[PDB]
């Protein structure tokens, strides 16, 4: 088998539909990577930093979870070629009057544990003077956002946008931070090299034959 761990709630990359079924961009791509490569694919959805721990323990073989490729992360993981862009911004409720990172001084800002959002928040904390609240789970972070206990939640643009499209009480009034790495498939550094190659080879074939484009189209994304 090939065991891949993912997030539990990260629409449109992985999420459950109305019949409790796991769907999303990451799900469609990984299933297709497995078919093209003839892998028995065993997906699990424990959560992002849960998936990180399962990967480092060897309980799974790699991760697909909207995971941003970063230079720092490249010291623990090997990544595929990117298959999506990676950008961060502040979600707020619709009725929020905050719009700039300078507004967050002396306020509590959420981030999911182990993520590029938490890293950026940590790197820019002295600059803007917010306090960082951490949650492993996106459900907990956005519950805090809705409850008013955090002034904003940093997360990835496509995920906030998608849920805004679902009519959730969310707005994107802040500038976005573009991260250069994009999203990749990740394995432990020096391990499972051929999973990365298989991912790369299938992804190129999916771009050239147009299956990649069709996956993004399913979820409302113009590529
Ligand atoms: N599933 C996630 O929350 C991933 C968030 C972000 N792209 C990261 O890589 O940390
Ligand atoms: Na980087
Ligand atoms: Na970063």
Residue numbers in the entry: 29 to 251
Authors' account:
The adenosine triphosphate (ATP)-binding cassette (ABC) importer GlnPQ from Lactococcus lactis has two sequential covalently linked substrate-binding domains (SBDs), which capture the substrates and deliver them to the translocon. GlnPQ is an ABC transporter involved in the uptake of glutamine, glutamic acid, and asparagine and was found to be a robust model protein to study the mechanism of substrate delivery from SBDs to the translocon. SBDs operate in a Venus-fly trap mechanism, where the binding site for a substrate is located between two lobes of an SBD, which is connected by two antiparallel β-strands (the hinge region). We report three high-resolution structures of SBD1, namely, the wild-type SBD1 with bound asparagine or arginine, and E184D SBD1 with glutamine bound.
In addition, it has been shown through uptake experiments that glutamate is transported by both SBD1 and SBD2 domains. The affinity can be easily tweaked by mutagenesis, for example, the double E184D_V185E and the single E184D mutation in the SBD1 domain yield a significantly increased affinity for glutamine (KD of 1.3 ± 0.15 μM and 1.0 ± 0.1 μM, respectively)24. An interesting structural difference is observed when the wild-type (WT) SBD1 is compared with the E184D mutant, which has ∼90-fold increase in the affinity for Gln and an almost 10-fold decrease in affinity for Asn24. The shorter side chain of D184 induces a different orientation of the hydroxyl groups, which mimics D417 in SBD2. Furthermore, the α-amino of the Gln ligand is differently positioned and shows hydrogen bonding to the hydroxyl group of T96 (like 28 in SBD2) and the Oδ2 of D184 (like D417 in SBD2). The hydrogen bonding with the backbone carbonyl of G94 is the same in the SBD1(E184D) mutant and wild-type SBD2 (G326 in SBD2). In asparagine-liganded SBD1, Y38 makes a hydrogen bond to the α-amino group of asparagine, which is different in SBD1(E184D) where the interaction of the α-amino group is made by the Oδ2 of D184 and D183. The herein reported structure of the SBD1 E184D in complex with l-Gln, combined with the MD simulations, explains the change in affinity for Gln when compared to the wild-type protein. While the global architecture of the binding pocket remains unchanged, there are differences in protein–ligand interactions. The shorter side chain of aspartate at position 184 induces a different orientation of the hydroxyl groups creating additional space for glutamine to bind with a high affinity, but almost without any impact on the affinity for asparagine binding.
